[PDB]
Amino acid sequence: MFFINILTLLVPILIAMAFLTLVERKILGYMQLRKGPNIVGPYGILQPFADAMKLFMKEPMRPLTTSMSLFIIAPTLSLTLALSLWVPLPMPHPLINLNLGILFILATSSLSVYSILWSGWASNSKYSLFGALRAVAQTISYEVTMAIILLSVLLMNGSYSLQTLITTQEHMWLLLPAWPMAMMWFISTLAETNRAPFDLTEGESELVSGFNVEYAAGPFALFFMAEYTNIILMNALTTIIFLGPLYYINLPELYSTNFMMEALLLSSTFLWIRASYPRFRYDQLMHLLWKNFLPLTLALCMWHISLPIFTAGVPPYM
Amino acid sequence: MELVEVLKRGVQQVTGHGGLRGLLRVFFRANDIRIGTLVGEDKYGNKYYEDNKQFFGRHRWVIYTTEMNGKNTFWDVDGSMVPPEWHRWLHCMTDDPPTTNPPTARKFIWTNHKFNVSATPEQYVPYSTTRKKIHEWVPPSTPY
Amino acid sequence: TYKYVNKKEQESEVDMKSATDNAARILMWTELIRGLGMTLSYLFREPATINYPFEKGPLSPRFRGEHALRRYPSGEERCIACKLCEAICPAQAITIEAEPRADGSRRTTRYDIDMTKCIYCGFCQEACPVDAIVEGPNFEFSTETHEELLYNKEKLLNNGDKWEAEIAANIQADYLYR
Amino acid sequence: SRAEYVVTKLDDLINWARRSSLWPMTFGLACCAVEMMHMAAPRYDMDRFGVVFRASPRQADVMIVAGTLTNKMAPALRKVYDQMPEPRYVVSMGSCANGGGYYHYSYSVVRGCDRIVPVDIYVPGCPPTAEALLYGILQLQRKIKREQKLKIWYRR
Amino acid sequence: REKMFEFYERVSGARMHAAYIRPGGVHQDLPLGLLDDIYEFSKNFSLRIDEV
Amino acid sequence: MNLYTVIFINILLSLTLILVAFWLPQMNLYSEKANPYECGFDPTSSARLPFSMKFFLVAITFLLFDLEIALLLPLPWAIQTIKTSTMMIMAFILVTILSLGLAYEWTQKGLEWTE
Amino acid sequence: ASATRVIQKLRNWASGQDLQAKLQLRYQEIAKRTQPPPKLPVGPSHKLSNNYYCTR
Amino acid sequence: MWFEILPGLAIMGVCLVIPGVSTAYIHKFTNGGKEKRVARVQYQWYLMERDRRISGVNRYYVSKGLENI
Ligand SMILES: CCCCCCCCCCCCO[C@@H]1O[C@H](CO)[C@@H](O[C@H]2O[C@H](CO)[C@@H](O)[C@H](O)[C@H]2O)[C@H](O)[C@H]1O
Ligand SMILES: C/C=C(/C)[C@H](O)[C@H](C)/C=C(C)/C=C/C/C(C)=C/Cc1[nH]c(OC)c(OC)c(=O)c1C
């Protein structure tokens, strides 16, 4: 009965990941005054499945200069960590209930940067090495602020358990007492997931395709499934943390439906953002995060350390 | 209110193709279920519609026949299947359909259109249309 | 007369009213929200797409497309092998041979257009004194082999008979501009 | 037979996936590449056929030769074509690519991209209108639809 | 640009390579009704520049 | 045990898709296909040569700040102490010297990338 | 043009412009695709006299 | 038009609700119609182990009330 419960997590997520590729191509379409896919199936609904099938019948590439062990490991790691980020998410009851879920999300997210690094390095190509060394630069940019932002929000929550955020937001979104951190949190998630205007590791304009330039076929498909799963998860995580869905102990179906509506809406804003802005320069990404966000995040960390103290609003341990 | 008018046009388009079979046939062949005015039809079976309220470029369109010259074109439609009389109207090179301004008849004009025959056994094959230039000597057929 | 695109240094003083506006611009990302608005407005505009191949892009009667050899209303070929289309062709795309016919007429035994040399300039259409060679309105004639794009006389006369109904009306709509 | 029938429908299945996802390589040479950008423009929106431009030849299915191929660029065009994973298709677009075009007699021009790579579809014009290229692209999908790889494997 | 290509085609018959300006003048005169369409496009084009 | 099961299931899917990708397609290997990519021309040198890091000082400053995260992450448990004055004073100082350290590096052109 | 008045208000406000007055799409204000025949004028050397070529 | 985006946006929506609803129900189906007991601290884990021992069927979720004394 637990195996059936994995099915009803990993399969709906994978289906939802695929259609995000369709929603991306049609929202980008209509925002660009065109229609996006709409021939492959009714309104393109079969277009995601065509792309998947075609990619797994495409010849896979084994470049002569490549380090095969890491070349193969990297896409496999990418998609594993994308699916593993989901098992602790409470919706409103998580598949795996962890006391330090927030750290499991932080630690799993960091380890997924090594799929970019190892793949790029293992390709033994100049454009793939440029892409990898932007993954290093991008992580050094957003890592420090992203952890501290979480610390600030969790001092109103009382613990690193994700399931306790449901109870913190019983009467109010954390977005209100924390909208400065949500603004900084949201931009971090665009950097965490290599999403425009921060698609610097890929960055088709400057690097031909960045880290995955030497990847074709099914191995390259796994990288994308990982990229789009993370988009849903990071916005799903942002919905739990800051936009707490309605939770009634008698209507757990209500929390999921409301959780989905806000997660879909936030996922759309990622697609909305990609259609609206030019791409950052990856040196300027560091300056954004270290010279703007970091000074503000440290101050808000000190604000939220003191805030429960001088209002006697310390969250409970349990 | 306006939202209801929109659903009115939506219903009117869903039921305006003659049954469920009609709506599925048009929707999966053209991926479009608008309701134009039938402007005419050709000897091959293409139907020509128009709606001048649409913006220039979608105000005229053709639903290709499902069988032309013995080929099955239920799914395989290509723009070369429009004959030359409608080719001019369909491309907005004029303003009046052939049903009201027919082309001048000629005895050499093709009666039966022919679409792109590339890849098929009807395909054109180039060759030289001149005759031999240098004529060779023919030896006697007898001993000397 | 000239104008400055990026000059504005008629420096004003930063009022507390104005400084707080600069800060709200920077902290609240206001100009970046304006850009999000412009792409949101486009989402609710009707797309400019047309439903090809069921809908076609507009064309004019002058459109320079596929070539064709025309006839007179009696069915006689218009081409008299003058070779002026050949002398003008910028691409040397036309090859012609001629001789007296069986009835004595001046007619071509060969007439080729290598449609892979042609630049579709329409100059042959202008040079022809009897409207024999024209560029019809066809543009959907891509092939699966190079050799199918070397048109000899039979192919070009066949295009003439295929498209005459439409060619004749385009000349009727445009010859007065020529 | 039953197996020969099943192989036929499996053939349609794999073809359909390749017909419905053609990813041309971001790659144009001269003025013909401007009309290829118009086919991507809103009016024609090749994306609605499942046609997405991808920069890397590893991720690309189709190479559209959209402009003149000079001798200096001939080896490089072949190299990016070799690096395309198979199956892979070439659309030759324009007189320059088709056979040299306006530069057929130039000392520096390859008289047709089909001396360098195998070409599937030839699109005439200088340039072909975006619809002409679109007709050619859709004529490549029908060519794939006629593919019979699985059935031929069965009869080997 | 797709609309400006329409003005190129209505005078010359080609969307891009018009071959329309020639030593001594232009090849053909404007077709009737072309200046209205150029004017209709021009009255709206500054809004397009504004959006960009 | 559940958390071990769900992750093997994740790994097996990633493995299973990896095997299908390599043994399902029809592969035609030759030298010119499997050479590295570099925009159509041959690479002029291997990609394993040194690649100068213009942000190296920020890289090692990330390490120092990374460990200063490890000191602030116990705070959610620390605000449960009776010695609230102490907990708060230590917290304020810790964040303030991280800020003072950051200001010094910022003013020393330390955040600037080496040209 | 076919857009409801609610979506017109939404997209006018989001853009900050009056889109309805200046639409990207073309409807009826275009020229008719079949115009009457022209009658183009001759040039200044279409005279019958006083028009020797060597003087121009 | 823009509402043609909805068919895919609606599929994605249904997909994202199956995880939450299926997990909530599966927990009730494997825990006697009750929420899966959460054990954050050792004390709560002790209560589950005691409940497992006094149930009589070696399942912590088979509660015994005043019927049993
Ligand atoms: C070199 C870096 C230095 C920069 C950083 C300096 C930080 C200095 C912070 C000083 C703030 C301490 O603020 C101090 O908080 C404590 C407890 O929180 C308050 O103390 C009060 O509350 C505590 C419990 O909370 C009671 O037990 C106590 O009797 C009462 O006095 C003090 O009234 C207040 O003055
Ligand atoms: C990003 C993805 C997409 C789908 C985009 O929408 C479009 C379709 C891709 C574009 C823009 C280019 C595609 C191929 C290519 C490399 C063209 C050559 C080119 N490119 C030019 O500029 C960009 C020129 O500028 C004067 C040129 O002369 C030439 C010759």
Ligand code: SF4
């Ligand atoms: S259109 Fe130009 S290039 Fe083509 S055949 Fe005529 S004169 Fe030659």
Ligand code: SF4
């Ligand atoms: S087609 Fe016209 S120009 Fe060419 S040879 Fe014949 S008559 Fe002369």
Ligand code: SF4
């Ligand atoms: S065929 Fe004509 S349009 Fe195309 S590249 Fe050559 S010169 Fe340019």
